[PDB]
Amino acid sequence: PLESQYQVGPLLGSGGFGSVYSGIRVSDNLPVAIKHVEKDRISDWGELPNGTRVPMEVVLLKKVSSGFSGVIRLLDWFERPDSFVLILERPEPVQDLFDFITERGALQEELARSFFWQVLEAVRHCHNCGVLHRDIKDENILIDLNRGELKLIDFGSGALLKDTVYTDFDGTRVYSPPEWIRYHRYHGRSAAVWSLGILLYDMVCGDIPFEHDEEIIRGQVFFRQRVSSECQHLIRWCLALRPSDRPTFEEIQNHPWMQDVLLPQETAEIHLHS
Numbered sequence: 001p002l003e004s005q006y007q008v009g010p011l012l013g014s015g016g017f018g019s020v021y022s023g024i025r026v027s028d029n030l031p032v033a034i035k036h037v038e039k040d041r042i043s044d045w046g047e048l049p050n051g052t053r054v055p056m057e058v059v060l061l062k063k064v065s066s067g068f069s070g071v072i073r074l075l076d077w078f079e080r081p082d083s084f085v086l087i088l089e090r091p092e093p094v095q096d097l098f099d100f101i102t103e104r105g106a107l108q109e110e111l112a113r114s115f116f117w118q119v120l121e122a123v124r125h126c127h128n129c130g131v132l133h134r135d136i137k138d139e140n141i142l143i144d145l146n147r148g149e150l151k152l153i154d155f156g157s158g159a160l161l162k163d164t165v166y167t168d169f170d171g172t173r174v175y176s177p178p179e180w181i182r183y184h185r186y187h188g189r190s191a192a193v194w195s196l197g198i199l200l201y202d203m204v205c206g207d208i209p210f211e212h213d214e215e216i217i218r219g220q221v222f223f224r225q226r227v228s229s230e231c232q233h234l235i236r237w238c239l240a241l242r243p244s245d246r247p248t249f250e251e252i253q254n255h256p257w258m259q260d261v262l263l264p265q266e267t268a269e270i271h272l273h274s
């Protein structure tokens with residue numbers, strides 16, 4: 001135990017999630033990302049399937065770990081007197097969807113379809129494991145540039161998935177649905193589908209559709225780029241004002257705009273340069 005186990009490199013980012021460094025696991029040079037979270041900044045704690053007090057983040061990552069690579073894996077974690085330290089996987093090379101979209105502007109539909117599908121798979125995977133992510137957005141998605149695979153990251157606002165109403169939220173306001181804004185109430189699935197609608201708008205227009213509580217409440221969608229009618233229809237569907245009018249994941253993945261998706265390897269060859 002302790003970090004002669006890892007070799008710390010450059011800082012990768014910091015913000016509401018804490019501080020994430022690039023790292024290398026010494027015993028086999030596996031790339032890793034080392035995430036430090038302050039105890040003071042952790043409102044949400046859980047208990048391991050076997051005993052102790054840990055941040056909910058850790059509970060949730062334990063629940064979503066598997067061979068499936070569409071969600072980031074937690075490799076290990078350590079406690080410290082004032083902080084927790086998570087060791088997570090790190091694809092290489094890599095770039096977040098926010099930078100990628102900042103670089104290339106609005107994405108061609110074929111590449112947005114392939115990215116959005118993989119997100120849909122990642123999110124289904126998390127619902128399956130009893131975990132609701134609650135902060136789906138471009139900044140919380142990583143692209144493994146070689147294989148063309150996306151990884152959902154940053155479970156720091158997640159909660160156990162439940163079928164009753166949520167009355168707390170600490171994800172990202174511009175991705176939160178109308179019923180959270182007006183009532184401070186949402187159900188998990190349907191709030192997830194709305195954030196997915198924001199996400200898809202973002203990929204295909206190059207920016208999020210709504211900046212202010214006003215526009216969220218009203219949910220009128222203006223498209224600023226050429227975007228096909230089938231893609232516009234899917235987006236307006238995810239963004240139905242009434243939660244019960246939103247599509248299920250099955251209905252999203254059966255949408256005509258979602259047919260004939262590229263494989264990740266295909267996606268990198270054609271769109272990322274392999």
Ligand SMILES: COc1cc(Br)cc2cc(C(=O)O)oc12
Nearest residue numbers: 012013020033088090153154155
């Ligand atoms: C820049 O931040 C990051 C870089 C890499 Br590479 C992997 C992760 C995972 C998380 C997370 O779970 O928050 O943040 C990351």
